[PDB]
Design a protein around this nucleic acid. Structure first.
Ligand SMILES: [Mg+2]
Ligand SMILES: [Mg+2]
Ligand SMILES: [Mg+2]
Ligand SMILES: [Mg+2]
Ligand SMILES: [Mg+2]
Ligand SMILES: [Mg+2]
Ligand SMILES: [Mg+2]
Ligand SMILES: [Mg+2]
Ligand SMILES: [Mg+2]
Ligand SMILES: [Mg+2]
Ligand SMILES: [Mg+2]
Ligand SMILES: [Mg+2]
Ligand SMILES: [Mg+2]
Ligand SMILES: [Mg+2]
Ligand SMILES: [Mg+2]
Ligand SMILES: [Mg+2]
Ligand SMILES: [Mg+2]
Ligand SMILES: [Mg+2]
Ligand SMILES: [Mg+2]
Ligand SMILES: [Mg+2]
Ligand SMILES: [Mg+2]
Ligand SMILES: [Mg+2]
Ligand SMILES: [Mg+2]
Ligand SMILES: [Mg+2]
Ligand SMILES: [Mg+2]
Ligand SMILES: [Mg+2]
Ligand SMILES: [Mg+2]
Ligand SMILES: [Mg+2]
Ligand SMILES: [Mg+2]
Ligand SMILES: [Mg+2]
Lengths: 119, 206, 135, 145, 125, 50
RNA sequence: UCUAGUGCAGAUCUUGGUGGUAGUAGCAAAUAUUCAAAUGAGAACUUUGAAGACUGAAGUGGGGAAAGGUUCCACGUCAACAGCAGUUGGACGUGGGUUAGUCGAUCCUAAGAGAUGGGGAAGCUCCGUUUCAAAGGCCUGAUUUUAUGCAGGCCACCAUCGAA
RNA sequence: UUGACCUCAAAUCAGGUAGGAGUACCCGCUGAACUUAAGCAUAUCAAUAAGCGGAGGAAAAGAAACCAACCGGGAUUGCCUUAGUAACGGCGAGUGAAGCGGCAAAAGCUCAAAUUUGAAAUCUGGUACCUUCGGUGCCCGAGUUGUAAUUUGGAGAGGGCAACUUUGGGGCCGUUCCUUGUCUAUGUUCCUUGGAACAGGACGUCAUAGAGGGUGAGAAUCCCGUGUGGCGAGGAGUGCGGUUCUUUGUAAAGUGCCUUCGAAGAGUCGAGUUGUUUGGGAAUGCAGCUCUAAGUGGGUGGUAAAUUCCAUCUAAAGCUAAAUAUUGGCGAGAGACCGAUAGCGAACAAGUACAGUGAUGGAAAGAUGAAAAGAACUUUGAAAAGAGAGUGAAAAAGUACGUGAAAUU
RNA sequence: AAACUUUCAACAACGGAUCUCUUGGUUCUCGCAUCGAUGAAGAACGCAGCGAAAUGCGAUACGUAAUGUGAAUUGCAGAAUUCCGUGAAUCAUCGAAUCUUUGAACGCACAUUGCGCCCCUUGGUAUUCCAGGGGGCAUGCCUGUUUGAGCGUCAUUU
């Protein structure tokens, strides 16, 4: 069974930390029983619930950092985009669409026209 | 190009009471000391490896192609040659078998098949249906699994549905008069395919 | 010149290749200057170079470089072609003025071997072209 | 190695030629690709004729001067005489060559008439509105052989 | 015949796609036809089979036998029905693995998703 | 050697954990072709060379 | 009818397998074994006891370095291995086991290796190790927005690695 | 004394950037020998392999200091050809292009050198705000040892006259492209054989679907699919197709006639010598050294030199798609290919086990049966096993498992 | 005459050929362009209820989140609320995260799981010592800032 992330995202940070320490206590109490019993698969659900809780906590923290750095240049290098090194070093579509006043005037004066040949 | 040569074999020469074929070096495997690089050797290089720059396609003179296609068309109007291909035209009244240009506008395989039954190709279709057999050799698992006879070749002037109506009927081929492939007209280099002409095609042939 | 880096002048071959001293390095001194400057500053792109002075031991060159990361060059359409990645280490491939000079890349009958690229023309006219229908 | 009466053969295969053998199996597929590319380009320039108007020009090399041939471009004087500028012509489907010169009045006037015919045969849609659908053809060369 | 250039008629590729299929595609591969009654009552010819369907065997040595599905053993491309078993020498009962192509569904296990699937496939309920 | 590096001890521990036969439920699995453990090492037959 | 990786007795041919030789050569260095009981299906060889012997302290003893890597110990146990045997085992299977402020490593420098600065070299990289360098950090406080700058003074080896 | 400038430094200064992998194809440097010459040294192998540096989806080249000698052509690349030709070559062995012509594909351009001088008009950065691949305002700064506008030789600029013509950016809905999902026919009717019908025969159906695969034996009609169309989802996008808002703009561009001008790249061109290279031949290119220009000039015009002409371009600065390549990567489709001693070394826990100090070397090994139904139970035996029994269509299928050859027994 | 040798056949052996299979290879064609200091490729060590490998992953460890489908997984055990549903699954998709020790590998070193310095915080009666936790400290080069150096150098001082 385990915990569901959609009912954890409604919780606060402290509630989640208490949940996490309780789950770790349960995991220790289960590891002391695993050596007595022949088999104990209940431990898997507790492990995955710990993972879900930590994922939710990470998300909650990262979104707050995103909102702190919202709308300003120089945000951190784990909240930026990863796309690729070369695509990150590539010219933007602004810098690549820049032209001189000489070429702008010629593009405006003599653009490629739409012509057809029947008459 | 790499095959039989991804090893560093060198001959032991004479004095070791073995043959002078080059051998794998090192030790500890089983391949150590085995023959290598030879066509007589297990794991070696086949004699005269096959190349892609073999000649695959052949020039045939245009006029010889056309001579042969004309001959294969003329052989269609010979009941002795069509029977000798096994085309089941004994009850067919006479050939060249010409039907109306109404056949070019047929859209449905059912109607197309019924027209051929009425005209007389019923047995030449049943032959194909009965002749499906598994190919014998290793072509089966080379996407050549099923063999069968061919039935008639329907020749049209313009396509208004007939090729799609006859696309799924086994054995039946369709052709336009302009192209008229020799591979269809004389399959296996045997003359006398059963050809059903439309009147427009029979007229455009001139 | 370029002394052949070979121990004690032994080349282990035929007399035509026994030369050690009189060899000349097909690339120019301007070129090997551009190389060293581009290795010292790999974040920049070499644009051109020019002689400024010389003596018996040394030749002195000034290399113009351009930072393709600076926004004054990222913008400024006249110079943002250097910021494309096909211009990384131009000097190392021979795309500068002296690089093309030394590659022999000019128009005309005097540059038939080196017009489109020497190795390209060699590979072209030492290639057997075979067609489906053999001509 | 030299033997009975046979011609002296000069077969140049003493290099590692098997490493460089291009067999053009790609002939058919590459034709298909060219046709698809022409189709895509035509659809992208959907009214336009896929080729620029090229001039009629006289071939060099006294072996070939008996034949007239298609050239590169319309020789700025020729277009000026045709009554339009080089920049506008380049946007209208007329190849211009700035480096060739007119030394022959017959070729000059033939090309000028070529340009007049082209200008009378084309319709140029305004830069503003309608785009009055116009049934592209795919060759100006076939229309002006 | 085929006309698309995205489709393959290679036996090798088809067999690899069959034997290395994931469980989500083995579900669709393991479809079964409906009886005449149900194909009339719903308008569906066949459906992917699941655990609580009632089924009738129409080929093999277990011809005529009815039962309730017990397992859809997708790994083996098989179906275990209860009341269809082999009795071993050691008094044990071992389920016989059937292919759903040789079955006929007589009573469907319905839920929101099967109903949606049927209305999607053009059914009437 | 008794006085040894942690690295060598670590690799030795991995080898001790690898020095196992097969589990026998792996032989009962659907479409199983593993009969025995072919990567089995013994200190007398083959040295690790680490 | 088309097509070719198309026909084996040889190549001290390749790979795999099998014979005769042949139950043959042989299983003989290191002084040496014997009796009983127990165990066990079964004992020349396992265990115990009794006896007889050897190594003979520059040992067949007790410990270690390198190397090995769990061979250590226990329990179970014999299909293979232990060139006879085997109930035994450095074998097989399952587990347990290595506790440091004081023992070593860690640190120092040795022969030497090797960055930096610089200089060579098309270049992979080479030289060189205090050098043709603007090559650092150590004591005490003063202030009491106050944390630690300025107040002072001092000092000039100039990386680092290198020994169980 | 204070404050500048210049040049050089330090900072865990604020922001960034380079390295390595891969390397089939691409740009370069470096660079053999085996071999051929029936010997061998030039030559050839080869401007190849190996070594080194450097890129992208292509790279490079590229808008003539070209080809030519024609009634002249007109960036570059590639194909057909030119051509095994002209030429090189112990003129031996051998090597060996280019112009024209036909085609694929086509696309052109921009800086320096000019006084904005009645107004550094230019730009990075920081900071506040905003509709954020960026904009506006402010503030330090760069910069006159020259940042913008203006022009690039095809031209063009400064004045003077005369009239005309044409324009920008956002939104919305579609279409284009990419990726993806889903829906879309017809027998499991009868008899025989068989363990199983997917076999044979009878009667039928669908077919723009009889491609392929699966299912207890050769299945269009049992399943997935196939074929034909439909209905969606998510993106990229300025390619165009319509609609809507902003009016850019007392701006810009184009065209005619007169007049005065018309800047055009230097340790470079070129020359001598050396070396290498080329078909390049009194020297094809490249590099080193030495010498070292001009402006009605300079280069080229395939025999060195002087003189007189002619033709053709405009170097020493620069950008640019397509046609072209691709034994690598990702994703697809095919084959008169191989079929487990074959085919990649590897159809399997294969670059694995294993060997070697190490660089490196490098295997063998696929198939029970439809289904484990993988032999309950009795008995002899210490046990392994055997004999029975039993499962199976078949144990002449018993995990030493399809068939089960020969040697050998 | 037997035994023994040889030859043939039947059955049984040895062995693994032949035959038939093929989730593999090889070649041709087509389309696309996407590694890395935002830490790549590679490596080591670990991770499952019962695994030694292969495959997958990284102390959130054969995986977490999200989305889609819509009831499995399977060798055994176990689990059930997860079944007319924010939901099974070794499922598919995948846009958010985690990603030990390393590695171009970046505090200095490395045949060491070695030795440091700075900031914040906690504790031990502690600016200094010990420890714990979190966060940092490479090199070259560019733009800029700040602090400076030099009779290189200008002016202006009284
Ligand atoms: Mg001998
Ligand atoms: Mg030198
Ligand atoms: Mg040599
Ligand atoms: Mg052969
Ligand atoms: Mg033989
Ligand atoms: Mg013979
Ligand atoms: Mg032999
Ligand atoms: Mg004996
Ligand atoms: Mg002896
Ligand atoms: Mg022991
Ligand atoms: Mg023994
Ligand atoms: Mg024994
Ligand atoms: Mg050194
Ligand atoms: Mg030390
Ligand atoms: Mg010591
Ligand atoms: Mg020779
Ligand atoms: Mg010879
Ligand atoms: Mg010789
Ligand atoms: Mg190479
Ligand atoms: Mg390019
Ligand atoms: Mg270029
Ligand atoms: Mg000829
Ligand atoms: Mg040559
Ligand atoms: Mg010379
Ligand atoms: Mg050379
Ligand atoms: Mg020369
Ligand atoms: Mg049988
Ligand atoms: Mg059998
Ligand atoms: Mg058998
Ligand atoms: Mg025999």
């Amino acid at each position: 069974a385990g915990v569901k992330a959609y009912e954890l995202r409604t919780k606060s940070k402290e509630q989640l930390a208490s949940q996490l320490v309780d789950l770790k206590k349960e995991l220790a109490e289960l590891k002391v029983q695993k050596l007595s019993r022949p088999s104990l698969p209940k431990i898997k659900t507790v492990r995955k619930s710990i993972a879900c809780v930590l994922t939710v906590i990470n998300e909650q923290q990262r979104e707050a950092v995103r909102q702190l750095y919202k709308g300003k240049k120089y945000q951190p290098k784990d909240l930026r985009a990863k796309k690729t090194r070369a695509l990150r070093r590539a010219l933007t579509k602004f810098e690549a669409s820049q032209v001189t006043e000489k070429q702008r005037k010629k593009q405006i004066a003599f653009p490629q026209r739409k012509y057809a040949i029947k008459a | 190009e790499k095959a039989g040569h991804q090893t560093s074999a060198e001959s032991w020469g004479t004095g070791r009471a073995v043959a002078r074929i080059p051998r794998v070096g090192g030790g500890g495997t089983g391949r150590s000391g085995q023959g290598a690089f030879g066509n007589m050797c297990r794991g070696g290089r086949m004699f005269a490896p096959t190349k892609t720059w073999r000649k695959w396609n052949v020039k045939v003179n245009h006029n010889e192609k056309r001579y042969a296609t004309a001959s294969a068309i003329a052989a269609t109007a010979v009941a002795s040659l069509v029977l000798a291909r096994g085309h089941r035209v004994e009850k067919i009244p006479e050939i060249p078998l010409v039907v109306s240009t109404d056949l070019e506008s047929i859209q449905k395989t059912k109607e197309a098949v019924a027209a051929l039954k009425a005209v007389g190709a019923h047995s030449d279709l049943l032959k194909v249906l009965k002749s499906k057999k598994l190919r014998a050799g290793k072509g089966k698992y080379r996407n050549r699994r099923w063999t069968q006879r061919r039935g008639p070749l329907v020749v049209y002037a313009e396509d208004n549905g007939i090729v799609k109506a006859l696309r799924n009927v086994p054995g039946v081929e369709t052709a336009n008069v302009a192209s008229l492939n020799l591979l269809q007209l004389a399959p296996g280099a045997h003359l006398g395919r059963f050809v059903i002409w439309t009147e427009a095609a029979f007229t455009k042939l001139d | 010149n370029r002394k052949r880096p070979v121990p004690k002048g032994a080349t282990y071959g035929k007399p035509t290749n026994q030369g050690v001293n009189e060899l000349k390095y097909q690339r120019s001194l301007r070129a090997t200057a551009e190389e060293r400057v581009g290795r010292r500053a790999a974040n920049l792109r070499v644009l051109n170079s020019y002689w400024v002075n010389q003596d018996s031991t040394y030749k002195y060159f000034e290399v113009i470089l351009v930072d393709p990361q600076h926004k004054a060059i990222r913008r400024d359409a006249r110079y943002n072609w250097i910021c494309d990645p096909v211009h990384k280490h131009r000097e190392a491939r021979g795309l500068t003025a002296t690089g093309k000079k030394s590659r022999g890349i000019n128009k005309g009958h005097k540059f038939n071997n080196t017009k489109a690229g020497r190795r390209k023309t060699w590979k072209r006219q030492n290639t057997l072209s075979l067609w489906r229908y053999r001509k | 190695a030299i033997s009975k009466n046979l011609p002296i053969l000069k077969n140049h295969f003493r290099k590692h030629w098997q490493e460089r053998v291009k067999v053009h199996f790609d002939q058919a597929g590459k034709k298909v690709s060219r046709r698809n590319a022409r189709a895509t380009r035509a659809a992208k320039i959907a009214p336009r004729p896929l080729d620029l108007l090229r001039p009629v020009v006289r071939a060099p090399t006294v072996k070939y001067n008996r034949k007239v041939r298609a050239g590169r471009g319309f020789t700025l004087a020729e277009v000026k005489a045709a009554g339009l500028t080089a920049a506008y012509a380049r946007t209208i489907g007329i190849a211009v060559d700035h480096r060739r010169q007119n030394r022959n009045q017959e070729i000059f006037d033939a090309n000028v008439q070529r340009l007049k015919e082209y200008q009378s045969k084309i319709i140029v849609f305004p830069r503003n509105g309608k785009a009055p659908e116009a049934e592209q053809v795919l060759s100006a060369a076939a229309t002006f052989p | 015949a085929k006309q698309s250039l995205d489709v393959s008629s290679d036996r090798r590729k088809a067999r690899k796609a069959y034997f290395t299929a994931p469980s989500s595609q083995r579900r669709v591969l393991l479809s079964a036809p409906l009886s005449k009654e149900l194909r009339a009552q719903y308008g569906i010819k066949a459906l992917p089979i699941r655990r609580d369907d009632e089924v009738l065997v129409v080929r093999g040595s277990k011809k005529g036998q009815e039962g309730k599905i017990s397992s859809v053993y997708r790994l083996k491309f098989a179906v275990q029905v209860d009341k269809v078993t082999k009795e071993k020498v050691n008094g044990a009962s071992v389920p016989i693995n059937l292919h759903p192509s040789k079955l006929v569904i007589t009573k469907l296990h319905l839920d929101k998703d099967r109903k949606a699937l049927i209305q999607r496939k053009g059914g009437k309920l | 050697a008794a006085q040894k590096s942690f690295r060598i001890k670590q690799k030795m521990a991995k080898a001790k954990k690898q020095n196992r036969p097969l589990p026998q439920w792996i032989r009962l699995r659907t479409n199983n072709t593993i009969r025995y453990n072919a990567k089995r090492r013994n200190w007398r037959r083959t040295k690790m060379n680490i």
